[PDB]
Amino acid sequence: NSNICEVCNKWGRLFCCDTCPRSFHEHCHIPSVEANKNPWSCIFCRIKTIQERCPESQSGHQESEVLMRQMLPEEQLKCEFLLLKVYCDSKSCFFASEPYYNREGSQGPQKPMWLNKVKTSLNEQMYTRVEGFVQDMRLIFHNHKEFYREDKFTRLGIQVQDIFEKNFRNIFAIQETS
């Protein structure tokens, strides 16, 4: 197994996957690494199994159909993975914890949003459909763009949103288009 966490790329107290060489800090993995369970399979392994059990799940989908899906176990897992993929980028640090807004010439967003809040929401089963999760994720970056206006710091929102959107299209097998 790897000697660094797959998400944050640091060493420390790591839990190793039994079916692939990835390792995780307890609260870097999503969901948090489970108490017992030997063997234990990580979220990358669990997602791969879904695809392997239903190869047709990789055919193209319309985003509008994906968003209306109810958050049954497999969609819940897919959203957890997609959130994890965003935390894997080091630029996620900017969006992880609760933000605050005091900048000359800007007003804060009406509905602040951040990754740790989406993480809690997922953990507490607060989303009933994929759309709930996706809307909160996209709101993070939209609030950032709106607040930072012409500051070049706006680009961090663009960059992390691109990571999100690529991974959304991959995980939920959205039909490729130009």
Nearer to Zn ion, 13 or 152 (CB): 13
Contact call for residue 20 and Zn ion (CB under 5 A): yes
Number of CB atoms found within 10 A of residue 32's CB: 14
Contact call for residue 16 and Zn ion (CB under 5 A): no
Nearer to Zn ion, 29 or 144 (CB): 29
φ/ψ region of 102 (left if φ > 0, alpha if ψ in -120 to 50, else beta) reads beta
Query: Which DSSP category does 25 fall into?
Result: E
CB of 18 to Zn ion, least distance (A): 8
Contact call for residue 130 and Zn ion (CB under 5 A): no
Q: Which stretch binds Zn ion (CB under 5 A): 48-56, 62-70, 85-93, 154-162?
A: 48-56
Contact call for residue 54 and Zn ion (CB under 5 A): yes
Residue from the set 17, 71, 130, 134 that interacts with Zn ion by CB under 5 A: 17
Contact call for residue 96 and Zn ion (CB under 5 A): no
Contact call for residue 7 and Zn ion (CB under 5 A): yes
Contact call for residue 68 and Zn ion (CB under 5 A): no
- Give 41-50 contacts, CB < 8 A, sequence gap 24+: 41/17, 42/6, 42/17, 43/77, 43/80, 43/81, 43/84, 44/6, 44/17, 44/20, 44/81, 45/17, 45/19, 45/20, 46/77, 47/77, 47/78, 47/81, 47/171, 50/74, 50/77, 50/78
Nearer to Zn ion, 44 or 172 (CB): 44
- Distance from chain centroid for Cα 59: 22
Q: 3-state class of 149 per DSSP?
A: coil
Nearer to Zn ion, 41 or 154 (CB): 41
Contact footprint for Zn ion (CB under 5 A): 5, 7-8, 17, 20, 22, 25, 28, 42, 44-45, 54
